[PDB]
Design an enzyme around this catalytic site. Sequence first.
Site, short mmCIF file in Angstrom:
data_model
loop_
_atom_site.label_atom_id
_atom_site.label_comp_id
_atom_site.label_asym_id
_atom_site.label_seq_id
_atom_site.Cartn_x
_atom_site.Cartn_y
_atom_site.Cartn_z
N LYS A 101 11.03 -33.54 64.22
CA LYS A 101 10.03 -33.90 65.21
C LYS A 101 8.79 -33.06 64.93
CE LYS A 101 12.21 -33.74 69.28
NZ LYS A 101 12.26 -33.81 70.78
N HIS A 128 4.07 -29.14 66.94
CA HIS A 128 2.75 -29.23 67.58
C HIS A 128 2.07 -27.89 67.87
CE1 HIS A 128 5.58 -29.52 71.23
NE2 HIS A 128 5.09 -28.29 71.22
N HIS A 182 4.12 -25.10 69.50
CA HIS A 182 4.95 -24.29 68.62
C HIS A 182 4.11 -23.26 67.88
CE1 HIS A 182 7.23 -28.24 68.77
NE2 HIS A 182 8.08 -27.38 69.30
N1 LIG Z 1 14.95 -21.37 74.72
C1 LIG Z 1 13.95 -22.24 74.64
N2 LIG Z 1 13.87 -23.24 75.51
N3 LIG Z 1 13.03 -22.11 73.68
C2 LIG Z 1 11.89 -23.00 73.49
C3 LIG Z 1 12.30 -24.37 72.98
C4 LIG Z 1 11.11 -25.27 72.76
C5 LIG Z 1 11.48 -26.67 72.24
N4 LIG Z 1 12.07 -26.59 70.87
C6 LIG Z 1 10.24 -27.57 72.25
O1 LIG Z 1 9.85 -28.05 71.16
O2 LIG Z 1 9.69 -27.79 73.35
#
Ligand SMILES: NC(=[NH2+])NCCC[C@H](N)C(=O)O
Length: 603
Positions: free
Chosen positions: A152, A155, A158
């Site tokens: 995915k 963005h 991140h």
């Molecule tokens: N423990 C967590 N929720 N960390 C952040 C995760 C963010 C998730 N991968 C996203 O793209 O939105």
Amino acid sequence: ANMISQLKKLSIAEPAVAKDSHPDVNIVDLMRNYISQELSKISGVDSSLIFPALEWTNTMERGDLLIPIPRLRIKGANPKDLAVQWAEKFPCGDFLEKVEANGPFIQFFFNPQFLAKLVIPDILTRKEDYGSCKLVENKKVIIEFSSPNIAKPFHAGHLRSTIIGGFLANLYEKLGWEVIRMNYLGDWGKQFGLLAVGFERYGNEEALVKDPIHHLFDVYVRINKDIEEEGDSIPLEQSTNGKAREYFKRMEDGDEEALKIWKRFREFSIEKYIDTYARLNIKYDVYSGESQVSKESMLKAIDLFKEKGLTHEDKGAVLIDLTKFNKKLGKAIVQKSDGTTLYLTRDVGAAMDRYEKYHFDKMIYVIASQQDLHAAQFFEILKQMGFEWAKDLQHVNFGMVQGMSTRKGTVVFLDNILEETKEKMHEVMKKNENKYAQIEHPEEVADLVGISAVMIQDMQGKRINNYEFKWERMLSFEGDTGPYLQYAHSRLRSVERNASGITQEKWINADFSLLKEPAAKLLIRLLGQYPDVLRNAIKTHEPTTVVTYLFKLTHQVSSCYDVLWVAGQTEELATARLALYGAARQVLYNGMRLLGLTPVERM
Ligand SMILES: NC(=[NH2+])NCCC[C@H](N)C(=O)O
């Protein structure tokens, strides 16, 4: 063991040491100890109140530290009066240049020569450890950041999380903590069965290894267009969505190749990311993930939910009404109808895992402010589940980067492509300024400087504030930009003009009394503040403070270039000045590294 030793040599009594202050590695703490002890005697205020009461000054023209007298909370006294009074009979003796009164404030000015004698020698001695301090003993913290989703889009969210986190980790270390830099990859869910089905239908084993992150992404995009072209009167078993939900059936069962293929998506992905993160000076300790949640904790969690009585079904789904604990939260879903786990639940579990695995003293999640409630929830849940350590969890959020989506077709998608576009744009950017480049490795420098630009621009203001991604403004060598710091470091570095091991040694013994110019006094003042800067930043988790400090530094060094000439001077004068420039460069270096930058040294 260095500054206090210098104190012995100079034959100066060390002021009483407040608990937890660190006068040995922070001259501002030394100065704080001196002021509290002496101001305490004049007034009837215990130093335990004054120490914390001393504040920074808006400008160096108002001193180095000041105290809003009313904050001392002294019964029936006229602050305006006291200030005038104290500023009068206050002993500067060896530590301060002067003490002044300004309304209800009293302002303290450090002794520039005293500072020089301790600060320059200390910086040159401890070098890269200068800003360091042990304000913590045997404490462990987990800092989770970046955490992209496989296949995915990576963005702006991140990216931002990636930059803040990298810095928080460096900051936490120079301050004594043991840091576990964790990357919680989004690598599980029905979406991967789909992915598996897609790699089968359109995937290429060679493309997977050459470029796992891009290839898998393109594969995901294609397998989706099939899911749409179908859906209607198509046997919901030979359908794409079908084989997806089916192929995903590997969470209940094992191997069945169902994992061999997935474990490669993950591992090959992680192997690529590792190099990319290296460009941002980030090396993760653990590449955890939503998939890596232990079956044990996941079940133990769903279990404890009922054991405590927080659950309450609605529409066939399990929910937890956090309302009674904080109306701001809500009825958080922890398990939906089809009896399956959610994003929130995987976090509750992941926490439980991380704790028994590391038994951390603190855990920091660097996630966008878009997920505020999400965090606030599984934080309140972990609390009601009894787990005490829940109070040691913290969410460092941030606003969103805007207008970055350079991809003419959509949002930025692949991290490495970001670095690349920045580099390219900074390369031709460098080409246009003939005055700054004569380098041998343009490409290499472009990448370092380009990344510097992105990082600085992103950390300039408060984390919570939305900011505009401006290619033009950020890449320029003009205002307070990343390239500005790089070129400044370069100039400073060149000024050191090859500092032999024995040379940096004579700098430590230079006659600092020759640094009498105000422009110099200001830089020295500035240099002594780095340790305090870091101390304050971890207190707020805001890199701005550091970024703002580093620009004040470069600008003062700039002012010094006009007057503190090195060439053509007697040896004594050139040595005292170079000692200052060197110490200055060292601090600049340290600060940039802390922020995640790679100071350009080799042209
Ligand atoms: N423990 C967590 N929720 N960390 C952040 C995760 C963010 C998730 N991968 C996203 O793209 O939105």
